[PDB]
Design a protein around this ligand. Structure first.
Ligand SMILES: *[C@@H]1O[C@H](CO)[C@@H](O[C@@H]2O[C@H](CO)[C@@H](O[C@@H]3O[C@H](CO)[C@@H](O)[C@H](O)[C@@H]3O)[C@H](O)[C@H]2NC(C)=O)[C@H](O)[C@H]1NC(C)=O
Ligand SMILES: *[C@@H]1O[C@H](CO)[C@@H](O[C@@H]2O[C@H](CO)[C@@H](O)[C@H](O)[C@H]2NC(C)=O)[C@H](O)[C@H]1NC(C)=O
Ligand SMILES: [Cl-]
Ligand SMILES: [Cl-]
Ligand SMILES: [Cl-]
Ligand SMILES: [Zn+2]
Ligand SMILES: [Zn+2]
Lengths: 258, 258
């Protein structure tokens, strides 16, 4: 099986996909004081993210996260000339007493992280974009613990019980995908990295919101303690360690220093 | 598993895909004097089709045809703002003493037919375009018998012995894909139809050149007598019968009643 891997042990990821031994991998530790302010980095523009209930969307436990398949027509602009089509979103989380975001900020790990994965409009096929500079783009936001339930996230978290078993899937109504993300589109970090799971292909443009999304502690428990993974254990701690920068400069869309 | 079907045998295709029993199926019999002449149909334009030798391209015997995977960056323009990205091309053929084109012209079947399959620039995923109006576009040309060896086709036909076994594949150098097609881009027929294999999804824009391409008899034999298919039988007669019009209008880009 050329396509099986897990978090927390063998097979080593470079054996699954040699590209996971690359020099420009994700995730990374973001150090705001050392991020370079770039004023050409304009507010992100999201088109078509406010979905009606029909058509419904596939929601699947793939053993590695819960993944929501997005319909056609969702467009994300990093800028004019950097236009992307959204494919799917999924999440990374921890466990009882343990945060599980993938990116960190000055070494701080947040409770969880949402990824929205996009294909550059240059491509008709995700597989052709793998490893090509700017072929894929991921929008990432941190999920922080707060006192109030997040109603937008409850639409998905309340359905995880239906897909607890690995490989199981269900259909959920369309929802406002942009309500899963922060409201500030103007403050973000941006750098070039990789997919954070095998095949770990490089050339991915990462955009990480500076503003967090708040979930209740009960919601974060629902996320991290409902799903089962490969080989009968709870799907938890499904994040990768941060990776060497190897000379990369993380850019900021706002003066990030103090 | 439902990705399973054959030419001229069980399972009956509407079992494979009920969509194959649709009202707007392909191929069709083209009747030039009854096509609607539409002067708004502009000459076709192909961008990026003149490939360099590297990178190489996958050439595969999939048991239903020989299929060449096209690299990123190839586009077909059907009209202002109406672009499609080329994914792959494949062929349909007959047998000893038998033509095997899919489309016919006034009931005449040509020796063989080439299809270049494209995805509308609105989509990032072929699977999402299936069944959607205008989501896919196929460019088709007839292959006719002539006295001279076709040098462009010889680049592919000379490699079929390498992929005689069903499911085998090899790599071929990039070539000028437009040299596999007629040079007259101004005279063609166009109509809305379906994929001609399961899942027979409708909404496909078909464009059929009026000018033919010529292959030698000894090339047409190579095409039709080299590959093996399902069962232990030769891959031959790999075309679908023409389908009822059901009130569809076939358009012509040129006065075809003249
Ligand atoms: C969003 O970006 C802002 C910068 O505009 C980040 O705020 C910066 O965060 C760091 C880490 O929290 C703060 O450093 C800390 O300062 C405290 C107080 O002195 C110190 O005790 C800690 O040891 C640490 O050095 C930094 O001051 C803060 N800067 C500003 C201007 O507020 C923030 O982290 C970003 N958040 C995300 C999620 O990206
Ligand atoms: C290309 O179009 C021409 C017409 O412009 C077709 O030629 C006609 O064919 C029909 C029936 O076969 C005859 O009525 C005509 O006498 C032919 N007309 C002319 C003007 O030559 C031709 O069949 C088309 N070929 C293809 C492959 O589409
Ligand atoms: Cl590298
Ligand atoms: Cl592509
Ligand atoms: Cl799509
Ligand atoms: Zn992810
Ligand atoms: Zn075909």
């Amino acid at each position: 099986d050329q396509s099986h891997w897990r978090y927390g042990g063998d097979p080593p990821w470079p054996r699954v996909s040699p590209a996971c031994a690359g020099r420009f991998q994700s995730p990374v530790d973001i150090r705001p004081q050392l991020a370079a302010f770039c004023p050409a980095l304009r507010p992100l523009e999201l088109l078509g993210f406010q979905l009606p209930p029909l058509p419904e969307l596939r929601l699947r436990n793939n053993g590695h996260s819960v993944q929501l398949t997005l319909p056609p027509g969702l467009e994300m602009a990093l800028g004019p000339g950097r236009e992307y089509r959204a494919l799917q979103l999924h999440l990374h989380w921890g466990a009882a007493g343990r945060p599980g975001s993938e990116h960190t900020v000055e070494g701080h790990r947040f409770p969880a992280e949402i990824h929205v994965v996009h294909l550059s409009t240059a491509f008709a096929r995700v597989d052709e974009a793998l490893g090509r500079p700017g072929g894929l783009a991921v929008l990432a936001a941190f999920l922080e613990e707060g006192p109030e339930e997040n109603s937008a996230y409850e639409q998905l978290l309340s359905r995880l019980e239906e897909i607890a078993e690995e490989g199981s899937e269900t259909q959920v109504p369309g929802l406002d995908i942009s309500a899963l993300l922060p409201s500030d589109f103007s403050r973000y970090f941006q750098y070039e990295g990789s997919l954070t799971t095998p095949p770990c292909a490089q050339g991915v443009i990462w955009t990480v919101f500076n503003q967090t999304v708040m979930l209740s502690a009960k919601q974060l428990h629902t996320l991290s303690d409902t799903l089962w993974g490969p080989g009968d254990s709870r799907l938890q701690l499904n994040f990768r360690a941060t990776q060497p920068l190897n000379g990369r400069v993380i850019e900021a869309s706002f003066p990030a220093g103090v």
